Amino acid sequence: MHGSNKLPGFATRAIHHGYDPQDHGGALVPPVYQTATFTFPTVEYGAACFAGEQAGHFYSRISNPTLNLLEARMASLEGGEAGLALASGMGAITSTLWTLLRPGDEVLLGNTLYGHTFAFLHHGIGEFGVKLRHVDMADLQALEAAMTPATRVIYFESPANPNMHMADIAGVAKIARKHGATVVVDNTYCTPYLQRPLELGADLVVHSATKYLSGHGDITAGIVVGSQALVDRIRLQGLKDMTGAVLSPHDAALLMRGIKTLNLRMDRHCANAQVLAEFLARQPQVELIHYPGLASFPQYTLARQQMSQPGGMIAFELKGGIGAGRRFMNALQLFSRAVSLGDAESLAQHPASMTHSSYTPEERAHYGISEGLVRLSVGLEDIDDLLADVQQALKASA
Amino acid sequence: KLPGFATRAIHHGYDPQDHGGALVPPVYQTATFTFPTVEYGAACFAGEQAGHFYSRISNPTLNLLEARMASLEGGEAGLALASGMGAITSTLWTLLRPGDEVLLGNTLYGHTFAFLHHGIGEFGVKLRHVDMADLQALEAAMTPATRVIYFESPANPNMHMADIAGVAKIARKHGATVVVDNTYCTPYLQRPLELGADLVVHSATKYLSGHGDITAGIVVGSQALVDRIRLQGLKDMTGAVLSPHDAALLMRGIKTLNLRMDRHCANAQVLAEFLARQPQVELIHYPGLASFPQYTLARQQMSQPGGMIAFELKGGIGAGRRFMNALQLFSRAVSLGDAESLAQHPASMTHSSYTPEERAHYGISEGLVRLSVGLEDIDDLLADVQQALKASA
Amino acid sequence: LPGFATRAIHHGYDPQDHGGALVPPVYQTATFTFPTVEYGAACFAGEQAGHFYSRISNPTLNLLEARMASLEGGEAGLALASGMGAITSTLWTLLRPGDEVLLGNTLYGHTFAFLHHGIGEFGVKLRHVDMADLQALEAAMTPATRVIYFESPANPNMHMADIAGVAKIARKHGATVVVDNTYCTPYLQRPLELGADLVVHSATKYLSGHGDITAGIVVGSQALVDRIRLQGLKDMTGAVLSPHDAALLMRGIKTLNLRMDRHCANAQVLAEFLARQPQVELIHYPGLASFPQYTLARQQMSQPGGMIAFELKGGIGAGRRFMNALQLFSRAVSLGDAESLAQHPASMTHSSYTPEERAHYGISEGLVRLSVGLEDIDDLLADVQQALKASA
Amino acid sequence: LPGFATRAIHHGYDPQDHGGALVPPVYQTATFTFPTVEYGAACFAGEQAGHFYSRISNPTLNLLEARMASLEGGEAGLALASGMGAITSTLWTLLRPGDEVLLGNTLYGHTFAFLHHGIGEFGVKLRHVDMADLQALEAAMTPATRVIYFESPANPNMHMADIAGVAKIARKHGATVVVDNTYCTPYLQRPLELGADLVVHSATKYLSGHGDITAGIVVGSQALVDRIRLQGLKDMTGAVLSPHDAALLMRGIKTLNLRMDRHCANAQVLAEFLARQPQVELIHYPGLASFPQYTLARQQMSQPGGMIAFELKGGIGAGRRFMNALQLFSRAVSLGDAESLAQHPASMTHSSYTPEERAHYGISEGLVRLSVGLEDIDDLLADVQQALKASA
């Protein structure tokens, strides 16, 4: 009944948006433009592609048809005007912030960040005269209080890596509308399938597409989505001049392949993580567990409000300290010991004996890392196998 | 002895016996790497165990490419990145902070110029352009703030050369780091590290790939400097990660680098001889011509005069446009170092929205045409240039 | 012991054997070298765990083969450049002049062409029988019957064979049973667990799932697969799979369970919808209680599949108009892609024929085949609804 | 006509037809869709003028085919999954029971195996004759002779056939001449210009040049190639080339002239060196004045090639010591890689064999075959020199 102005469903757009086989000789899958350069029919047509007249292509670092399809598709999924594809999540983050900030500007930051994002801010751009301040983005009164006339960007992850701390994106956007700041949200953990910060009033979203968007752990990639004006600026300054973080057309095509199953994969990641999280909460050895789908989650209602499903990531604390975590990790036979997330393969990290092993018990405390803490990226394996693996690894941790 | 260049370009750093006898190295198209124990994992993030954890930091396919490029440039260490701009920005973001000065060659690749003036230069880094062939002017331009000297040699548009050894001697007195963009020559024709440069950068998109189908960058230098560029510039400040797939294609291209460069040079030498005596041509810049102003310096630094030609047509902008439009084998495109021959005329292409005085300011003649001479049969390339020249009347 | 999804992701691979790489490195190499001539000697002799040449064997292909064997519950796998590569390599190996092959009544067109215009012109005898009629199959057996070959479900009406029933007859008489399991995949049906000797796939379809590679798979005993590798593939077809494409196929397989669940859920809704429409004369979908072999389908397949066949009341003209009207479904041969596909044989693959020729070959004038994809079912229903209106 | 290097880079592609892309986009798609069923029908009926399914045809494959056709001076090209795919698809199409095929005296092992253990077991008669002996060839011609098939140069001698002389005989009797041109490539030898009807290649070797793909090519008349495509490939082998690998093959072809120049230059230096060494019993290299067919080779081949065969004094033991001493050459099968390769069949491929059967075949106990690569000749000379000392 209801006519042709209806938005196609998410799965339909993830598979089809922006591509009609009739435009490429009937190829069902778009051909891969693995070409660095594009030629011009005449010297004037070439002039126009550099002088902003002619729609077209000239050099793959600036723009490429395979990348453009990926970009338009991601834009559709996030409810944004425009997309940009980059060589990594760090490429997306750095290209964005290098574009938007200059000496004397302030950036307001979420209290916890991905480690390399933190390092970029504190040891990179923050050493070039950009002022940094961290604020708890879940405390809208504190955020309001931290706004200064120099605040140019508000940047955060929700949920945040690795503690799953959340912010009310719409609440932040409302503050930013009143004051003027540009809001940038790292939406890696949720993907557009679970949360769409642009639809809640954020200006820009960034992704490590290396994670769930790819889904298969075989590419490194970044995405930015936002307004045409901001994404164009990031493309033509951040990417073109300031980072050179160009995505391979081969990898862009793999990313698109992954996006075709994004809904199905996220459904399974979330279903598996919910079962594991409920199981873990009932085990003798587990002292504490943080999963957005449990009512014990400190920001349960904000998670329910913003996220359509509670995600594939679990954090928990074992009784018995670092010795328990070490024995837990070494006992794992199906979960892999590794960094990253959003792969088909289930992954685990025990930061006390892995990423933060060089520190002592005191230093891990002020960062906020328990000696029995472990982060799980719950994969796509049979839940009974994952339960069996965690169950036997808990037995070895005792 | 040291194996020869062609041998190293094919073999360096890889023994098939280490990868199940595979003649061609397997492609590590993986974002993450797992650990057998948390102890093994711990050591990699601190950096005691020589393994892998994450492909943005390091990956075995990229490592082979890096080692091989280091061998060809005669440097300690290599780094592979998503583009030439990824190489340049990762390098300069690592080496420079507000109040530092970078001394620059008088002309640079457009986006390098843009990065410098509208990017890092807007974050408090000072820029000064100097003629890198004028050693007296370079010495006089040095200040206590000078931390990097950066240039291409040869440089667009007129293939102007720097005296690399002369620059390094000056830099050494002031502690400064010399960075050379060696894209045009490749390590097969010129090795700036052997002339005293500290670091070399490449757009591997060009000749190193050779086939126009990847975008990639390379940095080669000392272990200490390359480690910092990896762990700061790449890891944190650009994220310009090269795909293992593209790294494998780049290695495939490098296996024929000597043969391709020989042919690019042989073809350009013929085209330069032809163009230098055509009526339509006012000036020609080709390092292999006896009349090239820096003929002697060029021959000290470069083993062959390269695949690039720039020339100026007497009829100015109109002649340039007509020459370009008449080409049927040469393609109208930016880029260089492909099997396919390419041509551009900046006054009617890249720098077209500008006026004549803005182009002369930037150092771009109205009739300036640049050719990337490809690998096609020279008789076909000659016929194309000949008929284009007639059309330019 | 581990679950299907677990095995589809992990079986046969330990990252610690390959520098900790989570994803296996791709062995895109034609040849392999030897540390000594005698290490090389043993590889060609066949008593040395190694590699020499990717047409014979390659580690990327070997992982794919082992994983596919696991999923089908078989001993050994072989990867080939196409479904036809799998079928031809298999039958060229197993048959010689004077042998008889018993065939399902309806086969994929190029399988039919291979049998009748290829191997059948080299002295191999062919006979077609209804594999659902176990009495008729038994009556058709001779001592010269070497191979029984069929698809289940088969084109055009999704006609099924009782695989265990056929296998019993094969064991009694001494024939080798080869089942094309392309439509079901090992996720829905495992013919080797029902007594078949070999299964073949067009991995181009559901196993890949994404329409970007052409590939074939054979699974069966080590004895049979070794012969097919070393004769059919090595000497008689050269249908070698690219390691690049084998890697992509493994990527596809990692989501096979999830994709098939969605294909089947979508197809069930669409079939139930089609069954209620005035334009539709008849429908063949294994998940409808009306399906003639519904009981056998529920017994042999764990889900009813992603494929629908139906007949439009208005015949060839209605078929043409229906197909031409589709905006979301694509007009294409092939199946098992994320994208929904449709074909109407009377106006596409078999258009030059007369109606009577098509009836002889078993294709109705109004027969449309749908490969139901992974799009939102509401979008697919809307597309089919408007196209049915346009079919009049 | 543009020159060979120009055509190897550009033939059949204008960037303006694919959005200005300097490098053609890779059509990694298994299927193609139709705007209407009528358009789709037209594809399956008899015309082409478009695309349907990548096993039949694909734009990436089509470009490779057209370019190879241009380089060989043929009407039409076909790309396949391997050299064996090329050979089998060709011979399965051209031969039926009762036909005879005349073969060169020695063949590539798997070609030999296909002929004798494959197609020869389906009622096709085989007969080996010296393809340099035109009187002997004329004598062997019967009314059933449908195909003449050979390599030139052929292992292990680098024995040359008189291609124009064979073709004259074939045209009188109405036989099709198929030449395996793998060793020379179209850059060195064009058998179609000497009167061959079809050429086949293992594009795995020199055409690729970089050891990273397996692929085959057929080039010949439109009428013959259309048959091989639509019968041999489509129905009888399914040896479909990946578009990814076809793109890599085109990448390799762009440097074919340069690579072959260097392979040939290096091989000549090593052959001249080997000729003057006391360990070497005899040497087969076409560029030595002492080569028995030196004149014929120069008439057919523009350069003497990158392959050397030679015999060591010391037989099998000396071969083993030579091979195991190599530090830059790799012990491997295959040829035409950037990397220099060596093999000693007595102790590698034909090692399980006893020295008795080897004798009446071409396989001497001392026979070593070198695929001379692109490395610095001084390094290759040094490696060969030290291995010869170790052989004693």
Ligand SMILES: Cc1ncc(COP(=O)(O)O)c(CN[C@@H](CCS)C(=O)O)c1O
């Ligand atoms: C929320 C978020 N934002 C950015 C990144 C960096 O993306 P990348 O540059 O593609 O690796 C990531 C990567 N996270 C990995 C990094 C593995 S080294 C992890 O912590 O497990 C991320 O999770």
Ligand SMILES: C/C=C(/N=C/c1c(COP(=O)(O)O)cnc(C)c1O)C(=O)O
């Ligand atoms: C266009 C192709 C279709 N079918 C193919 C097919 C093959 C042959 O598989 P390759 O194409 O050679 O991988 C084998 N076995 C079955 C049950 C098949 O459906 C089609 O129907 O639409």
Ligand SMILES: N[C@@H](CCS)C(=O)O
């Ligand atoms: N250096 C080349 C390609 C980059 S756009 C050029 O300027 O034409």
Ligand SMILES: N[C@@H](CCS)C(=O)O
């Ligand atoms: N003609 C090749 C075969 C590779 S298996 C060789 O003789 O080595």
Ligand SMILES: [S]
């Ligand atoms: S088909």
